[PDB]
Structures are given as C-alpha cells and as structure tokens.
Design a protein around this ligand. Structure first.
Ligand SMILES: [Mg+2]
Length: 76
C-alpha cells in the first residue's frame, strides 16, 4: 500500500550528519550542493539552489534533517 523509500532516509541521515558532524542539527545551503551531489549525484548545479532559497520562506538559510529530506524528495 503506497510504497515509498525508507532507504533514502538512512542514507540522508548519514549525509546530513557526515556533513553536520559539528552537532548543530542544521546545514547551510552551502554544504547542500556538496552534500546533495555526494548524496545521490543527480540534481543540477543551480536548481537545487532555488530550492534551498525557497527555504528562506521560513528559517533563512538553514535546513533541518526534515527540510533536508523535504528538499531531496522533490527532484531526484
Ligand atoms: Mg552546523
């Protein structure tokens, strides 16, 4: 019934962390481009950007493992 992909969640967690080991729980749209590519190597090089920009409609350049996953769930 409605099959998703609970596997990417595990890989993301490691990427969101492997990049945010500082123990902050938040990453800057900067690492993303680098974490997004090393995470699946599939997005563009200026589009994932527009996404991390839309984020500004709430926090302001800071994504939580939740947005991180919400930003990688759209384009893949
Ligand atoms: Mg941090």
């Amino acid at each position: 019934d409605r099959s998703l992909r609970p596997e990417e969640i595990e890989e993301l967690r490691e990427a969101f962390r492997e990049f945010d080991k500082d123990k902050d729980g938040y990453i800057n749209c900067r690492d993303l481009g680098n974490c997004m590519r090393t995470m699946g190597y599939m997005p563009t090089e200026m589009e994932l950007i527009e996404l991390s920009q839309q984020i500004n409609m709430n926090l302001g350049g800071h994504v939580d493992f939740d947005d991180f996953v919400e930003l990688m769930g759209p384009k893949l």
